Every structure is written in structure tokens, then in C-alpha cells.
Amino acid sequence: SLALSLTADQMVSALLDAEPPILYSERPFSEASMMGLLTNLADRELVHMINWAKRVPGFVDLTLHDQVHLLECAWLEILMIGLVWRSMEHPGKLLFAPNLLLDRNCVEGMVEIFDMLLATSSRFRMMNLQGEEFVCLKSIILLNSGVYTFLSSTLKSLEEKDHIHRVLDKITDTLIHLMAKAGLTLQQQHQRLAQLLLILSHIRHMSNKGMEHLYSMKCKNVVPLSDLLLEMLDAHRL
Amino acid sequence: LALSLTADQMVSALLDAEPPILYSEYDPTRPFSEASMMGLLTNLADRELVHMINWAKRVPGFVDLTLHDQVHLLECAWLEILMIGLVWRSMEHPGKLLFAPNLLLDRNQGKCVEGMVEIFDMLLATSSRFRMMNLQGEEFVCLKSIILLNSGVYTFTLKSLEEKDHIHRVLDKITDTLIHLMAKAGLTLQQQHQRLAQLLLILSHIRHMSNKGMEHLYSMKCKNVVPLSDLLLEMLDAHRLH
Amino acid sequence: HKILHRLLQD
Amino acid sequence: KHKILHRLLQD
Numbered sequence: 001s002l003a004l005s006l007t008a009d010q011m012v013s014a015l016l017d018a019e020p021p022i023l024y025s026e027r028p029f030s031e032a033s034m035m036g037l038l039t040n041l042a043d044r045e046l047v048h049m050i051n052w053a054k055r056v057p058g059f060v061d062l063t064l065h066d067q068v069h070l071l072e073c074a075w076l077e078i079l080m081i082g083l084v085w086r087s088m089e090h091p092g093k094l095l096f097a098p099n100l101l102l103d104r105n106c107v108e109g110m111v112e113i114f115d116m117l118l119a120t121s122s123r124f125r126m127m128n129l130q131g132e133e134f135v136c137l138k139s140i141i142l143l144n145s146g147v148y149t150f151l152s153s154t155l156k157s158l159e160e161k162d163h164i165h166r167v168l169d170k171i172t173d174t175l176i177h178l179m180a181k182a183g184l185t186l187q188q189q190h191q192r193l194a195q196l197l198l199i200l201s202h203i204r205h206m207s208n209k210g211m212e213h214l215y216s217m218k219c220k221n222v223v224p225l226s227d228l229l230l231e232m233l234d235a236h237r238l
Numbered sequence: 239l240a241l242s243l244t245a246d247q248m249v250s251a252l253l254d255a256e257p258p259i260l261y262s263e264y265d266p267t268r269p270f271s272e273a274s275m276m277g278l279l280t281n282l283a284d285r286e287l288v289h290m291i292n293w294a295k296r297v298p299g300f301v302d303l304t305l306h307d308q309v310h311l312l313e314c315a316w317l318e319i320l321m322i323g324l325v326w327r328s329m330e331h332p333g334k335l336l337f338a339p340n341l342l343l344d345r346n347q348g349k350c351v352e353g354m355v356e357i358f359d360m361l362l363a364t365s366s367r368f369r370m371m372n373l374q375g376e377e378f379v380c381l382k383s384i385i386l387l388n389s390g391v392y393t394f395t396l397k398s399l400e401e402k403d404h405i406h407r408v409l410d411k412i413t414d415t416l417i418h419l420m421a422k423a424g425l426t427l428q429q430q431h432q433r434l435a436q437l438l439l440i441l442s443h444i445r446h447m448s449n450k451g452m453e454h455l456y457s458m459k460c461k462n463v464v465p466l467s468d469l470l471l472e473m474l475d476a477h478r479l480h
Numbered sequence: 481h482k483i484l485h486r487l488l489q490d
Numbered sequence: 491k492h493k494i495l496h497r498l499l500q501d
């Protein structure tokens with residue numbers, strides 16, 4: 001209920017306030033040291049993601065089962081959009097942490113994924129993506145990515161998905177408000193809205209590819225992964 | 239010129255370009271096996287790909303691209319395009335996927351193929367979503383054209399970035415076209431932006447389904463379940479799975 | 481399944 | 491090593 005009553009400006013303030021902190025990583029790299037740094041970081045980011053999700057308007061209205069499902073579906077997309085955002089102002093580089101800013105050209109399989117991440121950062125930069133927009137988009141990923149993979153046909157199930165869709169519409173309203181505020185014409189607003197949401201298709205793609213990479217990493221059992229990360233990965237082979 | 243088309247002319251071009259609904263080689267004299275069901279779906283996809291190539295050439299802006307860029311976009315998007323078409327055809331068949339007029343399957347039939355039922359469930363869910371939104375044929379053709387032009391666009395010296403900007407101008411016209419359609423249909427201004435977003439967010443799900451289907455198809459290839467045509471092998475290989 | 485459950489409640 | 495798709499895009 002809170003979310004449906006919020007103004008555009010209050011939604012934005014709520015989302016800005018909810019933002020997680022930027023964390024740090026732990027001489028020369030090996031293939032092993034590298035991925036360990038990244039998975040250790042991911043694990044620490046995931047704990048902060050959970051607190052953030054609980055502060056996304058609408059999310060705590062959902063059942064614990066629905067919250068788990070949305071986070072299991074979205075978590076890598078959310079890490080990735082955060083990474084892209086942090087990297088916007090660093091052309092050719094990915095800012096994994098303020099003390100781990102990595103260029104493209106040593107982890108078997110990582111380059112294709114790095115390149116997709118760099119292209120998305122470059123796209124954000126070209127659109128001059130704003131912080132207020134970014135937080136709207138990250139909340140859309142949380143609420144959208146698993147919304148169609150709700151299985152039960154029950155009356156409680158649909159009331160659920162309907163609430164999620166009403167929240168999603170409010171976030172769309174919020175993006176449009178920001179664009180209108182910024183001086184965009186109606187035509188420009190609609191165009192920009194589409195441009196931003198089409199990037200989410202690319203973020204989904206990158207997550208799917210990254211998940212495949214992470215699964216092969218797990219089986220090979222040479223890089224240590226947290227119990228939590230192993231859980232989250234487990235959800236995607238299901 | 240794509241960029242000079244009006245909204246109504248864009249819609250007409252897209253509707254005129256639509257490919258036919260093809261029949262499968264379904265043989266009702268024999269029970270399905272994993273291999274025979276996969277054989278039917280891959281045989282159909284193969285014949286559909288030829289029509290898709292001819293459709294793509296009719297999507298405004300696509301023939302302006304170099305052959306290399308045309309190849310890349312279709313390699314990226316082919317399965318998403320087949321899947322959105324399947325979901326569209328299945329809208330008026332709750333619980334079933336109309337792969338073809340003579341191949342209308344439910345999820346229980348999907349279980350015949352190892353790992354296929356999960357993908358079937360996602361397709362059926364998307365069909366349900368379409369039905370619940372009352373997706374219109376004019377909106378559908380816009381979305382299918384968005385997939386072709388968008389899916390491979392961020393995997394694209396500086397006539398390069400002119401190709402990329404061209405694609406983005408075309409995608410902007412298709413947005414303009416969707417909004418026009420919704421306005422013409424009587425939707426309020428607020429309803430227009432809300433519906434645009436709902437439709438575009440489904441493309442995220444279609445991408446996801448494509449990625450899962452491509453992994454599945456690769457496993458079928460890697461287990462020698464079905465022989466794929468040289469075309470399907472190349473389209474699959476573009477995705478370079480393991 | 482379970483770790484995420486606990487984190488959400490906590 | 492000419493891709494089938496590349497040729498079909500010309501026919």
C-alpha cells in the first residue's frame with residue numbers, strides 16, 4: 001500500500017535512500033586470484049542487496065516465498081547493472097570496486113562477458129543515464145525478472161502478481177516524471193523510456209551467460225564459492 | 239527510407255511482411271519419442287528460418303545494414319523471433335503451444351523431451367501474459383521487429399557507429415509507432431507509457447527463454463538426439479555454448 | 481532455499 | 491568458410 005501512495009519524488013527519494021554502499025575488494029593476478037576476488041566481492045554485495053530489496057517500495061508487501069524467488073532470479077542482473085553504472089565514467093574499464101578497476105585485455109570465458117558489460121556501460125554513457133533513472137531500472141529488474149515464473153494458479157498467486165504489476169507501473173510513472181522534469185518532450189520521454197527498458201534485455205542476456213560461467217566454475221571446484229552464492233547458483237539450475 | 243515512413247506506413251509494411259504459418263511433418267501413425275519430437279521442432283525451425291530471412295529484409299532499415307551486420311542481428315535474435323511468434327500463435331489456445339496447426343502440444347507432451355518442459359512452461363506463461371494484456375497484432379509485429387534490431391545491437395571504425403545510430407533511429411520510430419497505435423486505440427497518455435513499458439519488459443523474458451532454449455538445443459546436439467541442418471548448426475554455433 | 485530465507489527475515 | 495545465412499541473405 002505504501003508504494004501505491006508514494007509521489008514520484010518520494011519514490012525517487014526512497015530508492016536513493018535505499019542504495020547499497022560501494023564495497024572494496026581484498027601483487028600480480030592469477031586466473032584463480034582474480035575470480036576469487038570477484039566472487040568474494042559478489043558474496044559481500046549480495047548481503048547488502050537483500051537489505052536494499054527490503055527497501056524497494058512494494059517488495060516487503062510480498063510473501064517471503066515470492067521475495068526469495070525474485071531475488072534468486074534477479075541477483076546477477078542486479079550485480080551487473082550496478083557494475084555497469086559504477087563503470088559509466090571509466091571508458092574501457094569495469095569498476096568492480098574502487099580498488100579493482102579492470103580493463104578488457106585471463107579468466108577462461110570472461111572476455112565475452114566483460115565486452116558485453118563494457119558495451120552496456122558505453123550505452124549508459126551515451127544516453128547520459130542519471131542516478132535517479134538507474135535506481136528505477138534496478139528496482140524494475142528486481143520486480144520484473146521473476147514475475148512470469150510464478151507457478152501457482154491460485155487466487156493468492158494472481159493478487160500477488162497484480163500487486164507487482166501495479167508497483168512496476170508506478171516505477172514507469174516515476175521514470176516518466178524524471179524525464180518530464182528534465183525538460184524532455186512527450187515524444188522524447190517515450191523514446192527514452194523504451195531505450196532504457198531495451199537495455200534490460202541485454203542485462204538479462206549477460207546474466208544468463210554469466211550464470212553459465214559461474215556454474216562451470218562451481219563444478220570444476222577450484223575457485224571457492226560461498227554457501228550463499230552456491231545457493232543462488234543452485235536456483236538457476238532449477 | 240525507414241525514417242521517413244509514417245506510423246501507419248510502418249505498421250502496414252510490417253503486417254504485409256508477416257511470414258506464413260507453416261505445417262510440421264507430424265506423423266500421427268506413430269507415438270512420439272524424444273528424438274521424433276525434437277526432429278519435428280528442428281525441421282519446422284529450419285523451414286521457418288528461410289521465411290524469417292525474407293521477413294527481415296522487409297523490416298524497414300534492415301537492408302541498409304552491411305551483410306555482416308544483418309548476419310549478426312539474425313544470429314543473435316533468431317530463436318527469440320521464433321519464440322515470440324510461437325507465443326503469439328498460441329494466445330488463443332490456453333494451456334497449449336501451437337507449434338503448427340498440426341502440432342498443438344500441452345506441457346505433458348513436452349515432457350517427452352528431456353529438459354523441454356521447463357521451457358514449455360515459460361512459453362505458456364508468456365502466452366498467458368499476452369492474452370491478459372490483449373496484445374494486438376499491430377503491437378506484436380512492432381515487438382518482433384524490435385527484437386531483430388535490438389538483440390544484437392550492443393554486440394555491434396566509425397561508419398560502424400553510424401550503423402549503430404541508424405539502428406537506434408529506427409528503433410525510435412518503432413517506439414513512436416507503438417505509441418501511435420495505443421493512442422489510436424483510445425489509451426490515455428499515462429496508459430500509453432505504462433503499456434509501452436509492460437510490452438518492452440516482456441522482451442526481457444523472451445531473451446531469457448531464448449537463452450534457455452539455446453542451451454537445450456545445444457544439449458540435444460551434444461547428445462546426438464537429432465541431426466540439425468547446416469543452417470541450424472551455424473545459428474546455434476553463433477551462440478557458442480558449452 | 482534456506483540462507484536467503486534467513487537473510488530476508490534478519 | 492562462407493556462412494549459409496550470408497548467402498541466403500543475398501538470394
Ligand SMILES: Cn1c(N)nc2ncc(-c3ccc(O)cc3)cc21
Nearest residue numbers: 038039041042079083113210213214
Ligand atoms: C562475470 N562473472 C561471473 N562469471 N561470475 C561472477 N561473479 C561475480 C561477479 C561480480 C559482478 C559484479 C560485482 O560487483 C562483483 C562480482 C561477476 C561474475
Ligand SMILES: Cn1c(N)nc2ncc(-c3ccc(O)cc3)cc21
Nearest residue numbers: 279280282283320324357451454455
Ligand atoms: C526449445 N527448443 C529447443 N531446445 N530446440 C528448439 N528448436 C526449435 C524450437 C522451435 C521454436 C518455435 C518454433 O516455431 C519452432 C521450433 C524450439 C526449440
